Amino acid sequence: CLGTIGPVTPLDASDFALDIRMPGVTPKESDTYFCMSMRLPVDEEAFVIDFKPRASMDTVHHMLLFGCNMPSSTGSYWFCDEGTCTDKANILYAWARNAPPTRLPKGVGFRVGGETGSKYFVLQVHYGDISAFRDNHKDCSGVSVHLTRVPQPLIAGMYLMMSVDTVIPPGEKVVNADISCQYKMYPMHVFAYRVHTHHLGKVVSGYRVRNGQWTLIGRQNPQLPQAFYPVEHPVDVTFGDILAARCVFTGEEICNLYIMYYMEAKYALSFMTCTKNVAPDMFRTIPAEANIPIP
Ligand SMILES: [Cu+2]
Ligand SMILES: [Cu+2]
Ligand SMILES: [Cu+2]
Ligand SMILES: [Cu+2]
Questions:
Q1: Quick one: which of 40, 105, 184, 292 is 20 to 30 A from 268 by CA?
Q2: Which residues form a coiled coil?
Q3: Residue 249 CA: which ligand is closest?
Q4: What does the alpha-carbon distance between residue 294 and residue 225 come to, in Å, rounded to a whole number?
């Protein structure tokens, strides 16, 4: 794993690869999350245009890569339940064993560095079940990243919808957490999504609503591989639209929908969020499919 090629590998006059890999780490308990950081080598703005997972296709179940400015630690590596970043950890990439890859569409890149872009990458690697006879070989799992200083026409970002707090009342088998915001920027084109709960989430769905008509962004059971699922055909969201989501919870709290989009570079923002339910009555009209469980 260790056996080396430099952290930075120039590719042509304006592109370089960044190899982001665990520094020969040895998981000891099943189910461990290890984190590392890597500063961008350039101070000027640059664009992330591709990723390649380099996962121990023995023990690694999951990887996440975040962009942020303040990694939770300055150590060679650390344990993620002490944090990923102290500031907002902007998710850029997810990999899970046996999930579909989700690729950056051509002409799309995440904008990093420069004035307002992320200064660091933070890698999180989830090691699952190990054995107690493991020879303490080292693991250097991670991700290789393709960066260019060539301006991309389309800039990728994340629209994070979060529920802020419903409670699961006593005597409840089903609870809906609803989230909705108006959209008032230049168009975004949603091309992947990821859902996240901890309370036994049943199904999480996100929609664009335009003139009262709902268009599915994506729906998934939150209990399975939390990578990014591709949107069958990218959904454009424009000024006047409402983003809406419903998390369906069972008795026997947090619901996040991460919506990965691109925007025209001239008009792009790298992140947006909704933590409100501005149009709660609209949910009376929500498609029935939003309440159908995904076992
Ligand atoms: Cu995992
Ligand atoms: Cu969580
Ligand atoms: Cu709960
Ligand atoms: Cu089709």
A1: 40
A2: none
A3: 3
A4: 13
Report how far ligand 2's centroid is from the alpha carbon of 44 (Å).
33
Q: Which CATH class name applies to 1-156?
A: mainly beta
Q: What is the CATH number of domain 157-293?
A: 2.60.120.230
Alpha carbon of 199 to ligand 2 centroid (Å):
9
**Separation of CA 199 and ligand 3 centre (Å):** 4
Report how far residue 223's alpha carbon sits from residue 213's, in angstroms, rounded to the nearest whole number.
Answer: 29
Q: Give the count of beta carbons closer than 10 Å to the beta carbon of residue 154.
A: 18
State the Cα–Cα distance between residues 180 and 281, nearest whole angstrom: 11
| Residue 88 φ then ψ, to 5° | -70, 130
Could you say which ligand is closest to the alpha carbon of residue 177? Answer: 3
Task: Write the DSSP assignment of the chain as a string of letters.
Answer: ------SEEEEETTEEEEEEE-SSB---SSSEEEEEEEE-S-SS-EEEEEEEEE--TTTEEEEEEEEESSBS--SSSEEGGG-SBSS--EEEEEEETTS---PPPTTEEEEESTTTSB-EEEEEEEE----TT-----B--EEEEEEESSPPSEEEEEEEEEE------SS-SEEEEEEEEE--SS-EEEEEEEEEESS-EEEEEEEEEETTEEEEEEEE-TTS--SPEEEEEEEEE-TT-EEEEEEEEE----EEEEEEEEEEGGG--SEEEE--BS-GGGGGG--GGGGS---
Indicate where the chain has its CATH 2.60.120.310 domain(s). Answer: 1-156
Rounded to whole angstroms, what are the CA distances from 94 to 1, 14, 65, 97, 161? Answer: 21, 26, 6, 10, 18
User: Which residues are CB-neighbours of 52 under 8 A, at least 6 positions away?
Assistant: 143, 144, 146
